[PDB]
């Protein structure tokens with residue numbers, strides 16, 4: 001048991017789901033049709049991969065997942081794509097008319113027509129589970145569905161499943177790849193209304209992933225295909241603890257205990273290594289020390305901020321592949337003396353480690369080099385509030401002139417909801433300030 | 441959201457409509473009968489936006505051809521793609537309007553309006569998911585100016601949650617010397633400010649100046665002006681008519697473009713009338729604007745740029761950053777990241793690389809002030825009111841139309857003067 | 862106390878949500894009710910214009 005149900009909302013959520021599920025399939029030896037030859041127990045099982053995959057009596061290993069979007073064209077490409085046989089038709093749920101980059105339409109107008117259906121389909125997956133652990137919600141901050149429908153869904157999931165855990169993989173917006181001028185509004189609105197209902201949220205800054213694809217992978221103009229493949233590697237590093245069997249493998253919930261010191265302070269900074277091209281990887285084996293050192297280089301972060309000009313409340317290292325504790329400990333001792341890792345006075349400074357022996361996998365015809373070892377650092381640093389600050393500033397510039405506010409008000413929202421959301425973010429920024437202050 | 445319902449009203453509206461349909465039928469690989477003869481699957485992927493699929497794999501426009509004057513029915517039916525239109529969708533009146541707005545809006549066009557609404561409802565009911573409406577018309581005439589704005593207000597009543605878009609042709613003394621055109625435009629603007637989600641100001645003064653100075657033609661016909669409008673209309677509908685990874689419809693794009701409901705009057709532009717830095721400098725230049733206004737006399741609230749052809753996207757990203765850096769004062773600081781760009785693989789017929797420009801600039805007041813000056817020249821001496829007050833109108837309504845357009849200009853100025861701190 | 866507080870959170874989430882979704886449906890309907898009432902006011906004005914043509918002949 002300890003099942004985990006993934007929910008993929010909007011274009012960014014859906015397309016990241018494809019990258020993730022294609023990647024899990026390759027990691028677990030599950031074929032496109034859903035068969036898994038190495039799995040001898042047909043119809044069911046208690047194995048580690050069963051946390052994300054239910055089994056049919058016909059040997060099909062089916063993702064414990066729901067894909068929701070308010071228009072058909074993105075989910076249609078899963079229905080007709082390589083992995084069409086992997087999902088039951090009822091897992092793939094589409095509306096006709098999208099939220100139009102408007103939180104109001106996603107949360108109220110269009111979203112209320114599909115919300116009961118979506119919960120019914122999540123319920124059929126929940127009833128398959130003997131010991132459901134929680135949900136992983138993949139969505140953008142910027143999209144109308146990504147922001148509005150997610151919030152609505154999270155609100156309803158708190159009603160129907162109580163305090164059962166809910167993790168987010170939130171896509172934080174960047175002007176290089178976005179086409180929506182109102183994302184700052186959608187972001188602040190969804191961040192506000194979801195805050196009470198999420199237990200942990202891993203933000204991914206599209207700009208951070210954009211710069212990594214340019215710099216490390218030498219891709220001139222990265223597409224979503226380029227970004228999502230990288231994102232799925234980071235998501236796989238974080239969920240690998242749930243999906244694999246291991247003697248030195250620490251569970252994700254055990255990291256969460258260390259990562260969330262107060263309910264609202266639930267936004268870990270993610271950092272991944274190595275992101276390297278096949279050309280550069282050739283005759284270039286990267287040790288445990290080199291990839292561990294790469295975690296403290298801020299060019300490798302999933303969110304653009306500076307931890308060095310902030311304070312640490314937790315540091316977790318999720319290794320995968322050819323890694324043994326001896327090397328990790330040596331590498332950490334080297335980093336402690338050589339780098340800017342200042343903790344708050346109320347936390348202990350020790351780094352927490354997890355190791356999965358199953359090495360990282362690459363999608364065929366990808367950009368990433370296949371490497372023997374890899375690492376994902378999850379840290380809780382006050383520095384991540386910078387991402388809130390940049391986004392809260394963009395919100396204020398527009399909201400002062402009520403630019404675009406009529407579209408939201410036209411679909412039923414009040415100005416009260418805007419300022420209420422901004423004040424919560426003002427408090428959130430203030431909270432991250434307060435935790436860094438020394439005790440008295 | 442996929443199906444858009446086209447409506448062409450009056451002489452101007454029907455001819456620019458006819459050209460619009462010639463160009464996109466060519467681009468999509470549709471011949472005058474209405475059969476697919478192309479090669480790329482991208483031509484058919486979003487064909488349903490403008491075409492209905494009839495029996496025997498026949499693609500038929502979702503167009504509603506409307507006029508009070510017959511004769512315009514013949515010219516469209518005799519033209520290159522005259523056969524392709526649906527015969528029942530032709531809804532033509534009797535005695536015309538004769539460049540009178542109150543005839544189109546209140547009396548003679550009001551009698552024809554319910555027979556048009558029947559064709560709209562029949563087309564709209566068959567749409568799997570109707571997104572909105574586009575109206576091609578002039579604002580200087582009688583039918584397209586007046587009955588076109590009555591259609592807008594009547595379509596709004598039965599479809600309040602659908603997008604209403606207009607390619608509204610602004611009148612100019614250099615192209616047409618009919619004296620009452622300033623009255624017609626000002627009355628139409630009073631409707632358009634209230635009842636449309638976004639209006640393309642295709643300006644006949646700018647089209648004359650382009651045709652004269654750039655294209656080298658000494659005295660241009662309506663055929664010359666329309667070559668530019670059909671190039672523009674093809675450009676600004678490329679985002680709906682082709683994919684690729686972009687997932688945009690009339691509402692999404694109206695949400696990103698229209699920061700205030702009344703300020704939905706855009707400045708179109710095309711290039712060339714070539715390398716990527718040249719395209720990018722050309723489309724932002726005042727000479728390429730299909731509205732006769734200078735960007736540098738105001739500020740951009742939002743901009744949409746749409747490139748077409750095989751070209752390096754890295755280079756397009758660098759060049760669009762370049763012009764925003766170099767022209768920083770001409771984009772309002774209080775809307776971040778307000779210039780957006782899409783690239784389409786498929787170029788238009790003839791050109792290997794083209795760019796199309798859509799801009800919501802506060803400089804558009806230069807177009808409304810010009811009309812307002814021509815308007816107030818006539819109105820303050822009560823000239824030619826017997827045309828309008830005879831058909832039933834009051835002077836009060838003439839004063840309201842002037843005041844609404846002066847408020848529109850005042851508001852464009854307010855946000856042009858606005859600052860962040 | 863652990864049950865009480867978990868129920869409290871389910872309770873108040875449910876009530877907060879129902880209050881917002883109702884308040885929104887009031888607003889969006891009042892917005893569309895005003896838009897149609899302005900459009901119906903034009904039909905009443907266009908009936909006075911068509912009468913003032915006939916009552917001036």
Ligand SMILES: Nc1nc2c(ncn2[C@@H]2O[C@H](COP(=O)(O)OP(=O)(O)OP(=O)(O)O)[C@@H](O)[C@H]2O)c(=O)[nH]1
Nearest residue numbers: 010011012015098099100101140142143144145146
């Ligand atoms: N990383 C990543 N970001 C994406 C992807 N697709 C869209 N985005 C980003 O998500 C934001 C836009 O939201 P979408 O998810 O496209 O919109 P949506 O949630 O489908 O909502 P509507 O389309 O408005 O109904 C922008 O910041 C995009 O750049 C993707 O495949 N990967």
Ligand SMILES: Nc1nc2c(ncn2[C@@H]2O[C@H](COP(=O)(O)OP(=O)(O)OP(=O)(O)O)[C@@H](O)[C@H]2O)c(=O)[nH]1
Nearest residue numbers: 450451452537538539578580581582583584611616
């Ligand atoms: N750009 C362009 N402008 C045109 C064209 N045809 C007419 N116009 C302009 O339209 C204005 C007059 O309006 P029309 O469309 O002819 O009149 P109408 O709306 O059909 O009204 P009636 O003539 O009363 O039926 C003038 O300013 C013309 O210069 C055209 O093909 N292209």
Ligand SMILES: CC(C)(C)c1[nH]cnc1/C=c1\[nH]c(=O)/c(=C/c2ccccc2)[nH]c1=O
Nearest residue numbers: 179676677679693694696744745780781782
């Ligand atoms: C990202 C990009 C370039 C697609 C964009 N972002 C905001 N606007 C646009 C473009 C358009 N925006 C529009 O509003 C638009 C209007 C339109 C389209 C078809 C028919 C009538 C109007 N046409 C466009 O090409």
Ligand SMILES: [Ca+2]
Nearest residue numbers: 039041044045
């Ligand atoms: Ca099994």
Ligand SMILES: [Mg+2]
Nearest residue numbers: 010011098687
């Ligand atoms: Mg979408």
Ligand SMILES: [Mg+2]
Nearest residue numbers: 450451509512
């Ligand atoms: Mg005519």
